RNA sequence: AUAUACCGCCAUCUUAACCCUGAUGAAGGCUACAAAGUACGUUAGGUCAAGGUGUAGCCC
């Protein structure tokens, strides 16, 4: 339901995403990502689609950022101090290629 | 006579945290082609034979 305002219409029962809105949303998201990378924030890419795990991990390594394409263990973020250490620094921005 | 006086020696028995979910109810938390889970005393005991320190008994 919450995706309806972003849908241009249904073509023979297939939803078409309105790309005029995608352009503005992508503009905002890319601007935010660039500003966070300028501030030396930790950026974590996340995606559980196994078809693109290798691509996303390579891209994360290439841009000097972080990836988590594997099974997401309970408490990675909310229990990070127990899992990583008391002084671990969490990501400042998380990007989902697949939500 | 007493270790049913102690000591020695033998033997008997006794000796968590964090994080999530449920409307932050009682409560619950697994799937790998992965979906919240991760970290000494005790004994009416034996032994007075390879050992001791005491205590009492009778003493026409
Ligand atoms: Mg005895």
């Amino acid at each position: 339901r919450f995706m309806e305002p972003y849908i241009f219409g249904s073509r023979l029962d297939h939803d078409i995403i309105d790309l005029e809105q995608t352009a503005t949303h992508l503009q905002l998201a890319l601007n935010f990502t660039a500003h966070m990378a300028y501030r030396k924030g930790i950026i974590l890419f996340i995606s559980r689609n196994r078809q693109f795990s290798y691509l996303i991990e390579n891209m994360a390594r290439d841009c000097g950022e972080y990836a988590h394409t594997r099974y997401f263990r309970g408490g990675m973020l909310t229990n990070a101090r127990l899992l990583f250490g008391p002084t671990v620094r969490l990501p400042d921005l998380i990007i989902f290629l697949h939500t």
Side-chain angles (χ1 to χ4, degrees):
Chain A
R1 262 191 81 168
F2 298 159
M3 278 297 297
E4 292 161 337
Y6 310 119
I7 291 168
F8 185 77
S10 177
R11 177 64 187 181
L12 279 295
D13 212 43
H14 288 89
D15 291 336
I16 300 292
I17 295 140
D18 186 16
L19 281 189
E20 294 294 328
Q21 287 185 75
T22 297
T24 65
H25 280 268
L26 186 51
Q27 173 56 249
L28 278 167
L30 279 172
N31 187 73
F32 192 81
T33 305
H35 275 285
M36 290 300 306
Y38 177 96
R39 293 181 183 271
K40 302 158 118 183
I42 291 156
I43 298 171
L44 177 67
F45 295 92
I46 293 170
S47 175
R48 281 301 282 128
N49 199 328
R50 312 169 56 220
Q51 185 179 336
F52 308 110
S53 166
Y54 187 73
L55 181 69
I56 288 152
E57 293 189 326
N58 267 334
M59 183 278 288
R61 192 198 55 244
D62 293 340
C63 67
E65 294 306 335
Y66 305 85
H68 192 323
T69 66
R70 312 296 177 149
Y71 174 75
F72 205 89
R73 291 192 315 164
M76 191 271 260
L77 294 171
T78 62
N79 206 19
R81 284 169 209 300
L82 183 63
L83 294 174
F84 290 112
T87 43
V88 67
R89 190 181 147 197
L90 277 186
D92 306 277
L93 169 63
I94 292 160
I95 302 169
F96 289 90
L97 279 298
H98 303 83
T99 64

